[PDB]
Symmetry: none
Subunit: 329 residues, 4 copies
């Protein structure tokens, strides 16, 4: 039987699925293995399941001569050298985008937890000193307030559909507008980009449709935003200039920052940080952070794992795998 | 099996990728097919891979009633009627912008080719009369010189990063400044447009971060003996003003990847590159819109359009969709 | 007034500088004079400014009995018989090496022009048939590629500094290593010559910190190189077997060859052709050549000329010139 | 106030005058090597040093001479220099290009002709005053038609083959790296193995090869493999030949003769070190021909080696990057 190496943990039913057609070498832990250990395992593997920490270059492939398929549990392939895979006769497969709904829900979670001081709230409970209602930790509510969705991609749409029932004033900007029937059913209003920053108490960058530049929220964008506004970034680490966010928090321009993603995650930028700035880390009163939990919901992780496993099983059986993005031989 | 028509040449690996789920009708040549021939192939097609010469308007869609997805191998959609596609139930997809880095490297190639007289050099070699060093083709060096990047969008930033090691005095103008870390990492100094034109030995127009051209009035503000390197777009430089400045000695050289005759979406337009420029082999260096003409990059643009097509035909929401059909 | 003969063209301010102390007989053309014409001019000369094409032997000196100084506008003296100058009472001076940076810059010029098909592109523009973008002239980019600098002398260091911002994988080999702070600043990694030849998309021979080797890029080296690789030679003609390179180009081993220097200009070995091979000259599609333009920038040529002229002015005034390599009489 | 430059060995007077323009020269007026203690004493307050092969520039040396800014080595290598220590002490360390190849080839051929033709015994017979015309004596071995193997096609081995090409011999060579097609034909040389070269050669000439540094290649085992009555010509370095094995092979008739320009007693920085040239070799004037490391001892070459070293020193003292620098100090 062929051997398949899984660089990260998967659900036991994925292992059983793969076990019928292959000998499985799992990662039994929740940790990322060092590259040398992944290679030591994959050196005589016929198949690999790759995750976000994996970096597949030709040096990797030269040390893994039996490899026939890399099934990535990922919707894109930034850290894969796809043509190297093709030249080495290695199928490279991805999965469809299943991150949209759990990312929209978590974004609403970061918004609520940050505006309502829920983390400082929890810390006060755990202190043992709670003695009843007090006039403290007064936050900012949603109803009557104006929230701006920068970009109406699939995530932006999923947020608008969910915030429609909260009796807010919902604005969005995008090069391409929503249909008329969706703007009415979500009570969301199309405006320009400078107007959205200007009127919004809450600014929520999603990925726009179409294209466009890097650091969508820089010092210039922050200066146009309303004083005492909140910025919630569950989109991409490149979207927000964290150091400008530090200065906007210090001067009172920003009331708070919530993020699920960080500039240190962008392995495409050379001008790249190696940690989350400690000024953000220290500011527990005004920040709410999560470690890229956007799609950390069991049912979605399972489905991403199953599609990657199905691609591997297909390729080992001799077929074109459903998620192939190349054609090797 | 569904039918995909490819209006322009693509790499054989992309054809194979699409062939696993569709029957592919490729353009086997390196030319643009006339619109009449494109429409005739796409008449009974389920998908189309479109390139820059494709003008997808209502008429085109009406001729192709089976179209379900148009996968543009492009970052923009100026030549596409998005609402028409939506009304005809056709997905319209684009690819992310992969042009920045090959364009910045070609800009530096043009700079070095022009300032070092490398084209006339190559022709002296091919002529067979080379017999060793001569006091000929003295050019202008980079070290110690002042270069201005007009606009600090993506291309402008990729140029500054690459020229940072050449020991020049680097300037830029843009309405939106860089942050302190970028300015100091790349040793680039922000100035006004007029200061840039006044101080610079080399002027490199780029796309600014957010939304003036090099005309006779701008050329008169430049330093006598300066060089202009245009790999941005054809509309940013007045070519007849540049001809005049090359003749008077205001400009020592002009290099371009882009030309006025490319600006289709504007009525005032020349049909060719001016003979005075084509003839000025000593002071010009030109490439035929080779900005992103690197195989690794073309392949990925093709692969992303192909993946967009494969997704739509299998009934998913394609990753590059910019509309919502039906 | 003493007479100074200049065998090659010089900038007019060099003529002006020398005229204060001597009558100047210049080469008004950009051509090399035949030896017999150089001698006929130098016959009554007290001084001579010499360049790379000049060849100063005892027979030459015997024909110029008033000569007191040869000011070589060169960093070396391979073409001068030093002790014949000494015996004839003639100062021989050189200039410092000023070639490093313009040579490094042109080397990158050659790399970009070759890999991006810029010569063919310019020809296509001049043919008059340009009608916009076409899927033509697809070349090889820099970013992500592996470039090896064989030899980390001065020119090699200047190349690595300049390529440091191009997001490549930079390798180098040398018996004398760079220091850690330079490998870090330039992101360049030391390897062996075999490692370099096997891993590199681009190979760039430079002068090592210290070694004695002639014809390092031969049929054996090209056999070890990656198929479809490019070779850029701005070093010296003896570094690359041009016949070996013709074969590697035909077989597909090399995608391209760019050179500023040629075997035909080597005058320290007799078995040398006196033309560039026709197979190279004809292959305009896969080669990019320049006629020894490595230091052909006005600012460097002028300073080379000024240092030679200052040496002449000093020696004529009875001083010991600053560039002297001998002691005459 | 002029910097001081110490020259540890004798140099031509032109080089001294060349240096004097920008420095005060402390020369070695003798043709002898000075003791290290005297070298160090002269160089203690020197700004510059011209080093030769006996000089051993270690941390102790640099710490004794704190004002040193440049060491100009009139040498092509740096085995005797602590390069990193020089760097850390802010001292340019410079070498000169290899200029020893052609004169070493010429000398090697001189040794071969002098040995095979008994020219030294012949000159002894002339000096005795007893010459009265031709005699059937000192019959030697000629070159034409014979087989000569060059063990190593480095620069010296290549210069020898080029010069022996007109002598109408059968030239063989061994080397882990071959010579490409063309040189092998212009010089009439054929690649063989080491064991085959030893077996077939009338004359064996070891040179330095390309790449592979193999040790002590000609010992008693290698001499046992050579053709009986062969001649051995060693002028590359003193480690490649076991001299006591040569004494034995000469006594047994395995070797007809041995010529050398280098000797084991020269190998200092290797533990294998006798102090003298074996008396059995010195007494054997009929079968040996020796020179005291004259491989590069031609006036025009020594002058140019010295000139380049001086120029390196002049450049560094002027604040320039010296042309032969192998380090970047400070």
């Amino acid at each position: 039987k062929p051997k398949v190496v899984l660089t990260h943990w998967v659900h036991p039913e994925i292992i059983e699925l793969l076990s019928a057609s292959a000998d499985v070498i799992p990662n039994t832990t929740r940790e990322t293995l060092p590259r040398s250990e992944v290679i030591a395992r994959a050196k005589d593997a016929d198949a690999l399941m790759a995750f976000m920490p994996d970096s597949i270059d030709s040096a990797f492939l030269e040390e893994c001569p039996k490899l026939r398929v890399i099934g990535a549990a990922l919707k894109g392939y930034d850290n894969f050298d796809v043509n190297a895979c093709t030249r080495h006769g290695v199928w490279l497969t991805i999965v469809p985008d299943l991150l949209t709904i759990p990312t929209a829900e978590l974004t609403i979670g970061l918004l609520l937890g940050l505006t309502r001081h829920m983390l400082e709230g929890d810390r006060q409970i755990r202190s043992g000193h709670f003695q009843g209602w007090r006039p403290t930790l007064y936050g900012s509510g949603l109803t009557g307030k104006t929230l701006g969705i920068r970009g109406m991609g699939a995530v932006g749409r999923a947020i608008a559909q969910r915030l429609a029932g909260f009796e807010m004033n919902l604005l969005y900007c995008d090069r391409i507008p929503l249909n008329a029937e969706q703007e009415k059913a979500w009570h969301v209003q199309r405006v320009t980009l400078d107007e959205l920053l200007e009127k919004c108490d809450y600014v929520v960058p999603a990925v726009p449709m179409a294209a466009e530049t890097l650091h969508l929220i820089d010092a210039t964008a922050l200066a146009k935003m309303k004083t005492g506004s909140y910025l919630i970034n569950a989109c991409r680490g490149s979207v927000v200039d964290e150091n400008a966010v530090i200065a906007a928090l210090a001067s009172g321009k920003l009331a708070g920052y919530a993020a699920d993603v960080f500039e240190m995650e962008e392995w495409i930028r050379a001008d790249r940080p190696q940690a989350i700035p400690k000024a953000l880390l220290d500011n527990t009163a005004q920040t709410f952070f999560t470690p890229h939990l956007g799609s950390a919901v069991k049912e979605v992780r399972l489905e991403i794992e199953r599609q990657a496993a199905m691609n591997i099983i297909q390729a080992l059986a001799g077929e074109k795998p459903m998620g192939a993005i190349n054609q090797p031989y």
